Design an enzyme around this catalytic site. Structure first.
Site, PDB file in Angstrom:
ATOM      1  N   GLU A 165      31.889  36.803  29.066  1.00  0.00           N
ATOM      2  CA  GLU A 165      32.447  37.319  30.296  1.00  0.00           C
ATOM      3  C   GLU A 165      31.706  36.601  31.417  1.00  0.00           C
ATOM      4  O   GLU A 165      30.497  36.522  31.365  1.00  0.00           O
ATOM      5  CB  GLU A 165      32.238  38.822  30.389  1.00  0.00           C
ATOM      6  N   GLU A 219      35.039  43.809  42.484  1.00  0.00           N
ATOM      7  CA  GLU A 219      34.561  44.905  41.636  1.00  0.00           C
ATOM      8  C   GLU A 219      33.662  45.846  42.437  1.00  0.00           C
ATOM      9  O   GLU A 219      32.735  45.380  43.101  1.00  0.00           O
ATOM     10  CB  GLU A 219      33.820  44.360  40.413  1.00  0.00           C
TER      11      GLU A 219
END
Length: 272
Positions: A139, A241
């Site tokens: 990721e 985010e």
């Protein structure tokens, strides 16, 4: 040695400051990538229903570089709103050549997104032939900016006390140093179910809300630090985010483009 693209379709991020309007607002989890009509891009939202109101609004194919979006969150549990290239077609990063993202946005101020937050480029990649099983899924984050928190100013770059993991090195892309971090996530949620995988972060030392991200600069120099992405790039998307808080993100520009070493456009969005 890599020529900066000169193409007239490239919007100058520094002066891309016109507020955009319209488009469809999404208030719910998308369940992975969802393709956008008349666009090469897909969006994804992660909106945990145990938290408050969140949204993402795509500004459409014909304005703000074509990937521009607005997002809002009201006391979320780890909101992620993202939009960009969806790949997942068994190609390594090198296949896509020199990847760029021109951006310009407004956001809410310090401490409006909880203890942790990220703005920048995000995706995953798969490296199934890696001998270290932990490194078979990656990721990744290129972090241009964040909201800071109660302890740290949003003008001060985050460190490993936020991300976790280990400082691997540093390098320079697009006029700032980036501190490079590798973190192991042990039996955590992923695009592949609950498992162990690695995370790569480039943290911009000097946070910004506009400019161009030379994405390939990161991919290449991660590789120089021994941080390999493998041969199946999942996506490359502009991300907001927010761990918690009450806030917003509003792009006047998100423009992805790709070019060869000569600087000639391979892909871009979008008489007097």
């Amino acid at each position: 040695q890599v020529v900066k693209p000169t193409d007239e379709r490239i919007i100058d991020p520094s002066t891309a400051n016109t507020q955009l309007t319209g488009g469809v607002t999404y208030n719910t989890t998308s369940g992975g990538n969802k393709p956008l009509a008349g666009s090469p891009y897909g969006y994804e939202t992660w909106i945990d229903t145990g938290g408050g109101v969140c949204s993402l609004t795509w500004y459409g194919a014909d304005q703000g570089g074509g990937a521009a979006f607005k997002a809002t969150w009201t006391n979320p549990h780890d909101f992620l709103g993202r939009l960009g290239y969806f790949w997942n077609e068994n190609k390594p990063y090198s296949h896509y050549e020199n990847i760029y993202c021109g951006f310009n946005y407004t956001r809410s101020g310090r401490k409006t997104a909880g203890d942790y937050s990220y703005i920048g480029i995000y995706g995953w990649s798969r490296n199934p032939s890696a001998s270290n099983s932990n490194e078979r899924l990656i990721e990744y984050y290129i972090v241009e900016d964040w909201f800071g928190n109660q302890w740290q100013a949003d003008t001060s770059p985050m460190g490993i006390n936020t991300t976790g993991g280990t400082v691997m090195g540093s390098f320079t892309c697009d006029g700032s140093s980036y501190q490079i971090i590798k973190n192991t996530r042990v039996n955590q949620p992923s695009i592949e179910g609950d498992k162990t995988f690695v995370q790569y972060f480039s943290i911009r030392q000097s946070p910004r809300k506009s400019g161009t991200i030379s994405i390939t600069c990161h991919f290449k120099k991660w590789e120089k630090l021994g941080m390999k992405l493998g041969d199946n790039m999942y996506e490359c998307k502009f991300l907001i985010e927010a761990g918690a808080g009450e806030g917003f993100f509003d792009a006047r520009l998100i423009q992805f483009y790709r070019a060869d070493n000569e600087g000639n456009i391979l892909q871009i969005t979008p008489h007097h």
